[PDB]
Design a protein around this nucleic acid. Structure first.
Ligand code: GTP
Ligand code: MG
Lengths: 949, 167
RNA sequence: GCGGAUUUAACUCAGUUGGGAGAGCGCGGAGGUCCUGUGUUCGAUCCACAGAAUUCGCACCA
C-alpha cells in the first residue's frame, strides 16, 4: 500500500496525466481520511526518510493531522498517544527535519494538534522534554523549529481570527490556563536565554523569531515574565539595530496593547521610558511606520486611560494627561509624513484623541495651548489632502493609487469634521484662509503645474458644507450676515477657476455649482454665467472624454434645481449640436457579436439621455409662449419618430435599425420625463402623437425585448405626462407586452403595471384581473426553480422582492377582489402559501413577507366564502411558534403581529397538545394576546427567546 | 518563465469562473463545483516579456477537495478568493492563508473579494481587514464585469519578476 | 476582537415594507433636507451601499 500511496500522490502532482488516473489517485488519498484503517499507511511513511518522497510524506503528515483533530480524548487516548510517541521519536532524531520547508512546517502542525489533545493531563512534560531536546541539540535551525511550535500553539489559542466556537473557546481557554499553571515560567525563560544568546551571536534570524513569540504571547501571558528589567533592557537595545529594529517595535507595541487595569498600564507604559526612542526616531519608511504604530499604540492607550472615571486620582490624570500632551509632537510629525502608510498608522490615536477632546470642550473652552494643536493638526491634515505636486494626475480610472488616495481623503475628512465639532469657528476661519490661500498661490503658477493646488481648493469647498443645506449654511440666522460657506463659495464662483483646463478642476467646479445651487437662489443675477458655463466649450461641450458625459448630468441637475427663466432659449439652442444620436455597434467582453446592449453600453447615450430630459425641463420652466414651446416639442418628437420610422421600415433585423429604434424611443421617454404631470399644457398634443408611434414600432419590433423595455418605459413617462388621454389604449399596450413576456422582464413588467396602477387606480382593476393569471404562473415558475448559480439566485431575490411588493400594493390600493374573479380562483391558495414560504426561508423575505401575510388576514377576516383562509390562518401558527427555533426582532415583531390580528383558542385544544405542552408558557401567551399593540410585542420576544432557551 | 500559482478559496466563490474568464473570455452563469483540481496554463504579455502562470484551480468544497493542501507544493504564488455575497467565505479567509503558508514558507499572496458586481453585500467593506493584518495585497474584483480582473496577475508578475516597472 | 439597537417642527412623542407624513405641548393660520452622503428605480423618510452621532451586549486580557 505504501508504494501505492507514493504513486497516487505522484499521480495527483503531475497534471500531465489522464483524468482517469487522477480519479483513482485523488480518491485513494482522500480515502485515507475517510477510512478507519487508512491512516495506518501514513503513520509508516512520514517517519520513513530513506525510502520515501517528501511529496508523499507531506500528504501523509497532513492526513495524520486531520485525523488527530477528530479523535475524542477519552475514546482514542490510545491512538492519539500512539501517533504522538511516533512523532516525538521522529522529532527527537533531528535528521530529516532539514528536508524541504513544507516537511518541517507540517510536522510542527501535527505536533501542535497532538499537543492540543493531550497536554493538560496526558502530556505533562510537553514543554520540559521538548525544550530539553532543543537545548541538547545546540543549533539555531533547531531553536527556530521550537520557536515556530510556540507560534503555532498561539495561532491555535490566541488567534481571534479563526472560527469562534463557544466550545473550541472553552477548550482553548483550558489549554491556556494549563500552560499558565504549569510551564509558562520556563517557556519564557527558555525563549529569553535564546534571545540573549543568539542576540550576542549576531544571529538575527532566530532573534527575530524570538521577538515574535514575545509579540504573539504578550497578549495572554503573565506580563511580569515579559517586563522584567533584564528582558526589557535587551529590547530597548534591539531598538537600535537595523536588523532587529522593527520586530522590536512590533513586540514593543504588543507589550503596550496588552490589556489591563488603567492604573496598571500607566506604570508599564511609564517603565518602558519609550520617549527617548521617540526623540531620536532618517530615511527608512518601514521603520517610521513601525515607530508610528508604536506611538499610535501608546497614544490610543493613554487617551483611554484618561477617559475612565474609575480611579479619580489626578495623580493618574496628571501623569496620564502629561504623557499624552507629550506625545502630540510625534502624532503630528508622522501624521504629516509624506509616506501615506506611515501617517495612517496613527489615525486611530488621532481618532480617539479628538473624541476625548470634544468631550472635554463640551464642559469648558479649549486652552490657547490646544487651539494651536488643532490648528497644527489641520495644517497636517491639509497637507495629506492635496495631490502630490510631483507625479502628474493619472487619466487611469483603474489606478490603484487614485483609489487608495480617495480612501484617505474619506478619512481625512472625518478628522476635519470632528475638529469642526470641537471648535467650528476655529475650523471655519482656518479653512477659509486655506482655500483662499491655496487659490492665491495657484494664480502665481503656470497652468500646467497649478492644478493640484486648485483641485484641493475646490475639494475642500465641495465638502465644506456637505449636509448643511438649510438657508442657515449661507446666512446667519440672526444677523443675516454671510457664512464662511457663503464666503468660500462666493470666492470660488468669482475666481478664474472656471477657466482652468484640468479635468479634476472643471468637474469639481460643476459639482460645486450643482451641490450648492440653492446658494444662487439669492444672487439670481449671477445665474447666466453658470448656465452659459455649462453650455459653453468648457462645461457641456468639453473636449475631454470623462468631462463631456459627466457634464450633461450635472447640467441637468443644475437646471433641475435652478429653475426660477431668462436662459431658456440659448440653452435650448446650444444643446442642439448634441441631440442627434449616433450609437454604433461594438464588440465586447461578453459580446463577440455586437449586441444592442454592448453597442449602447459603450456609448454616451445613457448620459446623453439627460440632455433630452434637460431640454424638456427647460421647456416647462421657461418663458416661452405655448406656441413656441409646443413648436420645439413637436419639432423634436417628429424628428425622433422620424428616425424610428426610417429604421422600422428597413430590415427590422439589423442591429443598426434596432439600435436606432430603441434610442428614438428612449430619447422620447426621457424627453417626457422632464415635463410635469397632467389645465391644458401645450405639449399634450405633441406627446399624444408620440404615444401612437410606440404601437407602430411595437407592432413590428415587439419581438425584441430591448424595444419592449423601452416601451414599458416611454409609455409610462408619457402616461405620467398625458395621464387620462391614453387610458383608452392602455389595455392594448398591456396585451401586446404580455405575450413577448420573458423571465428577464418579469420585474420590469411588474413595476410597469403598478406604475400604472398608481396613475389610474380604479381604471387598471379590470385589466389586472385578466392579466394576473399570466403574471402569477410565470412568477410561480421562476421562483420555484432552485438557482443554478449566483446570477440566478440574484435574479430570484429581486423577483421575490417586487412580487411581494406587488401583492402588498394590490391590497393597499384596493384590488383584492380581482384575485377572486374566476380568472384567478385556482390561484388564491398558492399565492398565500407562496408568501408563507418566503417567510420561512432563512429578513427582507421575512419582514415584508410576514407583513403581507398579516394584511391578508385582516382583509379576509371571516370564514364567509374563503374556504382556505382558516386552515391557512391556522396554518400560520407553526410559523409563529416554531420558525425561530433553528433584524430578527422585525422578524419576530411581525411574527407577533400576525398572532395579534388572528387573535382579534384553536391553539389551546389543538396546538399546545401537538407540541410538547408547556402549561406555564401556554397561559402567559393567551394573557398577552388577551390583555396586552405595544404590550403583546414585548411578551412575545421575551417569550420565545425563553421558549427557545 | 513559468510560475506555479495555486488558487484557493471557499466553495462557490468563483475561482473557476475567474479562470475561464481569462482562459476563454466566457462567463459561466451555472455553478459546477470543481473536483480535485483543474489546471490550466493561463499566460500573459508584459513590456519586458511573456510570463506564464500555471494555475492550479483548487476545489474549496469539503466534499471534493481530495489532496487539499497537497496541491500547494512548490507553488510560487497564490490567490485567496472570497465571495462578497457570501459572508462566511471571508470568515474563513484566514485558514486558506494559514494553510497556504504552512506549505509555502513565503510567497506573494493576493487576497481577492469577488462578485463585487452584485450591489448588496454580505461581506461589508469594514470587515475586510485580513490583508492589512497579514501584509497582503488586496483587490475588489469581479469575474462578471472584468472589474480589476487583471490586477491580481499583474501585481504578482511584478513581484515574481522583482520589476515594479513591469507594466 | 466580534455583534446588535438608536438618530422625524420649539418641545414631545406617533407612524408606512418608497406615492410625500402627523396627534399633545409651544409663537385660522406657521414651523422637518423624516442623521448625512451615494446608488437602484418613472419616483424614497421607509430599499441598497458608504459614514456620523448616541448607545447596549458578548468574547479575550482573568
Ligand atoms: N455576479 C457575479 N457572479 C459570479 C462571479 N464569479 C462567479 N460568479 C458566480 O458563481 C458561479 C461560479 O462559481 P464557481 O467559479 O464555479 O465556483 P468554483 O470556483 O467552481 O468553486 P470551487 O469548485 O470550490 O473552486 C457562477 O454561476 C456565477 O454566476 C462574479 O464575478 N460576478
Ligand atoms: Mg474551481
Amino acid at each position: 500500500s505504501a508504494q501505492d500511496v507514493e504513486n497516487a500522490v505522484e499521480a495527483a502532482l503531475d497534471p500531465s496525466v489522464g483524468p482517469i488516473i487522477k480519479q483513482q489517485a485523488t480518491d485513494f488519498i482522500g480515502s485515507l481520511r475517510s477510512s478507519s484503517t487508512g491512516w495506518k499507511i501514513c503513520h509508516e511513511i512520514f517517519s520513513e526518510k530513506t525510502k520515501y518522497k517528501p511529496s508523499t510524506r507531506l500528504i501523509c503528515l497532513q492526513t495524520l493531522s486531520e485525523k488527530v483533530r477528530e479523535w475524542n480524548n477519552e475514546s482514542n487516548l490510545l491512538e492519539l498517544q500512539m501517533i504522538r510517541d511516533s512523532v516525538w521519536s521522529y522529532i527527537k532524531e533531528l535528521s530529516f527535519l532539514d528536508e524541504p520547508a513544507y516537511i518541517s512546517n507540517a510536522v510542527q502542525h501535527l505536533l501542535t494538534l497532538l499537543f492540543l489533545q493531550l497536554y493538560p493531563s496526558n502530556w505533562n512534560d510537553f514543554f520540559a522534554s521538548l525544550q530539553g531536546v532543543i537545548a541538547a541539540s545546540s543549533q539555531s535551525e533547531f531553536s527556530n523549529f521550537y520557536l515556530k511550535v510556540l507560534l503555532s500553539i498561539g495561532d491555535e489559542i490566541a488567534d481571534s481570527l479563526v472560527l469562534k466556537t463557544d466550545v473550541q473557546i472553552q477548550k482553548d481557554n483550558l489549554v491556556k490556563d494549563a500552560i499558565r499553571a504549569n510551564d509558562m515560567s520556563d517557556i519564557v525563560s527558555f525563549v529569553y536565554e535564546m534571545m540573549l544568546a543568539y542576540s550576542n551571536a549576531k544571529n538575527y534570524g532566530t532573534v527575530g523569531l524570538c521577538l515574535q513569540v514575545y509579540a504573539q504571547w504578550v497578549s495572554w501571558i503573565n506580563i511580569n515574565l515579559i517586563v522584567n528589567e533584564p528582558c526589557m533592557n535587551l529590547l530597548y537595545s534591539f531598538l537600535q539595530i537595523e536588523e532587529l529594529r522593527c520586530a522590536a517595535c512590533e513586540t514593543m507595541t504588543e507589550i503596550v496593547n496588552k490589556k489591563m487595569k488603567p492604573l496598571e498600564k500607566l506604570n508599564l507604559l511609564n517603565i518602558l521610558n519609550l520617549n527617548l526612542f521617540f526623540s531620536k526616531s532618517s530615511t527608512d519608511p518601514n521603520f517610521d511606520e513601525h515607530v508610528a504604530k508604536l506611538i499610535n499604540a501608546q497614544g490610543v492607550e493613554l487617551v483611554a486611560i484618561k477617559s475612565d472615571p474609575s480611579e479619580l486620582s489626578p495623580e493618574l490624570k496628571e501623569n496620564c494627561s502629561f504623557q499624552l500632551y507629550n506625545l502630540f509632537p510625534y502624532l503630528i510629525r508622522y501624521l504629516s509624513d509624506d509616506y501615506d502608510e506611515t501617517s495612517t498608522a496613527v489615525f486611530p490615536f488621532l481618532s480617539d484623541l479628538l473624541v476625548s477632546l470634544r468631550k472635554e470642550s463640551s464642559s469648558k473652552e479649549l486652552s490657547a495651548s490646544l487651539k494651536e494643536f488643532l490648528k497644527s493638526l489641520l495644517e497636517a491634515i491639509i497637507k495629506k489632502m492635496k495631490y502630490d505636486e510631483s507625479q502628474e494626475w493619472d487619466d487611469d480610472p483603474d489606478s490603484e493609487e487614485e483609489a487608495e488616495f480617495q480612501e484617505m481623503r474619506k478619512k481625512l475628512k472625518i478628522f476635519q469634521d470632528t475638529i469642526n465639532s470641537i471648535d467650528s469657528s476655529l475650523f471655519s476661519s482656518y479653512m477659509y484662509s486655506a482655500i483662499t490661500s491655496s487659490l492665491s498661490t495657484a494664480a502665481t503658477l503656470s497652468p500646467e503645474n497649478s492644478w493640484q493646488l486648485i483641485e484641493f481648493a475646490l475639494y475642500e469647498t465641495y465638502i465644506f458644507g456637505e449636509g448643511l443645506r438649510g438657508p442657515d449654511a449661507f446666512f446667519n440666522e440672526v444677523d443675516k450676515s454671510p457664512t464662511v460657506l457663503s464666503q468660500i463659495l462666493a470666492l470660488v464662483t468669482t475666481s478664474q477657476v472656471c477657466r482652468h483646463p484640468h479635468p479634476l478642476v472643471q468637474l469639481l467646479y460643476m459639482e460645486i455649482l450643482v451641490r450648492y445651487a440653492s446658494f444662487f437662489d439669492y444672487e439670481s443675477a449671477a445665474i447666466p454665467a453658470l448656465i452659459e458655463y455649462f453650455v459653453g466649450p468648457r462645461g457641456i461641450h468639453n473636449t475631454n472624454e470623462r468631462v463631456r458625459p459627466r457634464a450633461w448630468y450635472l447640467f441637468y441637475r443644475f437646471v433641475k434645481s435652478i429653475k426660477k427663466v431668462n436662459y431658456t432659449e440659448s440653452s435650448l439652442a446650444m444643446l442642439g449640436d448634441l441631440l442627434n444620436i449616433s450609437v454604433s455597434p461594438v464588440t465586447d467582453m461578453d459580446a463577440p457579436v455586437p449586441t444592442l446592449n454592448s453597442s449602447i453600453r459603450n456609448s454616451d447615450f445613457n448620459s446623453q439621455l439627460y440632455l433630452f430630459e434637460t431640454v424638456g425641463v427647460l421647456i416647462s420652466s421657461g418663458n416661452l409662449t405655448p406656441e413656441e414651446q409646443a413648436l420645439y416639442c413637436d419639432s423634436l418628437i417628429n424628428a425622433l419618430i422620424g428616425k424610428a420610422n426610417a429604421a422600422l421600415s428597413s430590415d427590422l433585423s439589423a442591429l443598426e435599425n434596432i439600435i436606432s429604434v430603441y434610442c428614438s424611443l428612449m430619447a422620447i421617454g426621457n424627453f417626457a420625463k422632464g415635463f410635469p404631470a397632467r389645465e391644458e399644457v401645450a405639449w399634450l398634443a405633441s406627446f399624444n402623437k408620440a404615444s401612437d408611434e410606440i404601437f407602430l414600432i411595437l407592432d413590428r419590433m415587439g419581438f425584441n425585448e430591448d424595444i419592449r423595455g423601452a416601451v414599458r418605459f416611454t409609455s409610462g413617462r408619457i402616461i405620467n405626462v398625458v395621464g387620462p388621454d391614453m387610458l383608452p389604449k392602455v389595455p392594448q399596450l398591456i396585451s401586446i407586452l404580455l405575450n413577448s413576456i420573458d423571465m428577464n422582464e418579469l420585474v420590469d413588467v411588474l413595476s410597469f403595471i403598478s406604475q400604472l396602477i398608481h396613475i389610474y387606480k380604479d381604471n387598471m382593476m379590470e385589466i389586472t384581473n385578466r392579466m394576473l393569471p399570466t403574471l402569477l404562473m410565470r412568477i410561480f415558475s421562476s421562483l420555484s426553480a432552485a438557482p443554478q448559480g449566483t446570477d440566478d439566485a440574484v435574479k430570484q431575490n429581486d423577483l421575490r422582492k417586487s412580487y411581494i411588493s406587488f401583492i402588498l400594493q394590490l391590497l393597499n390600493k384596493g384590488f383584492g377582489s380581482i384575485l377572486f374573479t374566476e380568472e384567478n380562483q385556482v390561484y388564491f391558495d398558492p399565492l398565500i402559501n407562496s408568501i408563507l414560504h418566503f417567510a420561512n426561508l432563512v429578513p427582507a423575505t421575512q419582514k415584508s413577507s410576514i407583513a403581507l401575510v398579516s394584511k391578508m388576514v385582516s382583509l379576509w377576516g371571516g370564514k364567509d366564502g374563503i374556504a382556505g383562509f382558516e386552515n391557512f390562518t391556522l396554518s400560520l401558527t407553526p410559523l409563529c411558534f416554531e420558525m425561530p427555533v433553528n433584524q430578527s426582532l422585525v422578524v419576530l415583531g411581525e411574527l407577533a403581529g400576525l398572532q395579534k390580528i388572528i387573535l382579534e383558542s384553536y391553539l389551546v385544544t389543538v396546538y399546545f397538545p401537538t407540541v410538547n405542552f408547556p402549561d406555564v408558557m401556554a397561559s402567559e401567551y393567551l394573557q398577552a394576546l388577551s390583555n396586552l399593540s405595544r404590550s403583546f410585542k414585548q411578551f412575545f420576544q421575551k417569550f420565545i427567546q425563553a421558549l427557545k432557551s | 518563465p513559468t510560475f506555479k500559482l495555486v488558487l484557493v478559496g471557499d466553495g462557490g466563490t468563483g475561482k473557476t469562473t475567474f479562470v475561464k474568464r481569462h482562459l476563454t473570455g466566457e462567463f459561466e452563469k451555472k455553478y459546477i463545483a470543481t473536483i480535485g483540481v483543474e489546471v490550466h496554463p493561463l499566460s500573459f504579455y508584459t513590456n519586458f516579456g511573456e510570463i506564464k502562470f500555471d494555475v492550479w484551480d483548487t476545489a474549496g468544497l469539503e466534499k471534493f477537495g481530495g489532496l487539499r493542501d497537497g496541491y500547494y507544493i512548490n507553488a510560487q504564488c497564490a490567490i485567496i478568493m472570497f465571495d462578497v455575497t457570501s459572508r462566511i467565505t471571508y470568515k474563513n479567509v484566514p485558514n486558506w492563508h494559514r494553510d497556504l503558508v504552512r506549505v509555502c514558507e513565503n510567497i506573494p499572496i493576493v487576497l481577492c473579494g469577488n462578485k463585487v458586481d452584485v450591489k448588496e453585500r454580505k461581506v461589508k467593506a469594514k470587515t475586510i481587514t485580513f490583508h492589512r493584518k497579514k501584509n497582503l495585497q488586496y483587490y475588489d474584483i469581479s469575474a462578471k464585469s472584468n472589474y480589476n480582473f487583471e490586477k491580481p496577475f499583474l501585481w504578482l508578475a511584478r513581484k515574481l519578476a522583482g520589476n515594479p516597472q513591469l507594466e
